[PDB]
Amino acid sequence: MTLFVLILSNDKKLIEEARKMAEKANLILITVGDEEELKKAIKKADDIAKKQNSSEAKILILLEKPVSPEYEKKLQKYADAEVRVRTVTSPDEAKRWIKEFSEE
């Protein structure tokens, strides 16, 4: 099961903590900045997963944006995987979600 993570959250220390956490968790973290660019990173995640594990993969998206259930499933149906869209505020919060994702 290949675990990916995307992020639209440009805070200096947040990005540090977020990467450091997922990096040592050996997750595929693609840091982009833009809603459209996210869809390209998400697509890339789909492509990378597809090669081997897109049968059942899980992806986390750490973004700063109010996310609704349907909104999650829109992105979830975009890349074939089970993506969990996550709005983040502070570095520690993002790290918690990474734990809830990689260590569920």
At 10, which CATH number? 3.40.50.11230
Burial class for 68, CB neighbours closer than 10 Å (0-12, 13-18, 19+): exposed
The whole-angstrom separation of Cα 33 and Cα 58 is 21
Which residue, 37, 42, 36, 80, is CA-closest to 61?
42
The residues with which 3 forms a beta bridge, in sequence order, are 58
What residue has token string 């074939």? 80
The whole-angstrom separation of Cα 104 and Cα 98 is 9
Q: How was this structure determined?
A: NMR
Range of the structural domain that residue 64 is part of: 3-102
The whole-angstrom separation of Cα 59 and Cα 15 is 17
Number of domains in the chain: 1
Instruction: Find the helix or strand (DSSP H, E) in which 79 lies.
Output: none
